[PDB]
A paper describes a structure:
[name] collagenases [name] and [name] are segmental enzymes that are thought to be activated by Ca2+-triggered domain reorientation to cause extensive tissue destruction. The collagenases consist of a [name] module (s1), a variable number of polycystic kidney disease-like (PKD-like) domains (s2a and s2b in [name] and s2 in [name]) and a variable number of collagen-binding domains (s3 in [name] and s3a and s3b in [name]). The X-ray crystal structures of Ca2+-bound holo s2a (space group C2), Ca2+-free apo s2a (space group P61), Ca2+-bound holo s2b (space group P21) and two new forms of N-terminally truncated wild-type apo s2 (space groups P21 and P212121) are reported for the first time. Comparison of crystal structures of [name] s2 with crystal structures of [name] s2a and s2b suggests that despite common tertiary folds, PKD-like domains can be grouped into two subsets.
Similar to the molecules in the holo s2a crystal, the four apo s2a molecules are similar (average r.m.s.d. of 0.5 ± 0.2 Å), with molecules C and D being the most similar (r.m.s.d. = 0.2 Å) and molecules A and D being the most divergent (r.m.s.d. = 0.8 Å). Molecules A and B, as well as molecules C and D, are related by a noncrystallographic twofold. Temperature factors for each structure are relatively high, possibly as a consequence of the high solvent content in the crystal (61.8%). The holo and apo structures resemble each other (r.m.s.d. = 0.6 ± 0.2 Å). As expected, the most notable difference between the structures occurs near the N-terminus, where Ca2+ reorients the interacting residues Asn685 and Ser686. While neither structure could be refined using anisotropic B factors, comparison of B factors revealed that with the exception of the N-terminal residues, no significant change in B factors occurred upon Ca2+ binding. Unlike s2b or s2, s2a truncates β-strand A through an approximately 126° rotation of the ψ bond of Ile692. To accommodate the change, Tyr696 packs with Phe706 and is involved in a Δ4 Tyr corner, in which the side-chain hydroxyl group hydrogen-bonds to the backbone four residues prior to it. In the s2a structures the termini are the most flexible. As mentioned, the B-factor trends in all holo and apo s2a structures are similar despite the difference in crystal packing.
Residue numbers in the entry: 685 to 770
The structure:
Amino acid sequence: NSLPYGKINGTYKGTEKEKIKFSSEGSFDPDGKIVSYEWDFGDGNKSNEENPEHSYDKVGTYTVKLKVTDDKGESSVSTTTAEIKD
């Protein structure tokens, strides 16, 4: 019955066109298992890797979302930012 806890380990920073390593380490479900991790990098791109690398084409500050869903189909969403400069 218990919702999963996502941990998105923000904030993130890097430079345009250089890969940034994201981590969902510490995410957990008290009464089950997390069966999916869904990242949205805020630049229209997504991943279902636990700990993806992603580069941003353009500078800016992007909203990063991590949606975790458990084995009973229940989800929760964590957010942070990725600040991309020169």
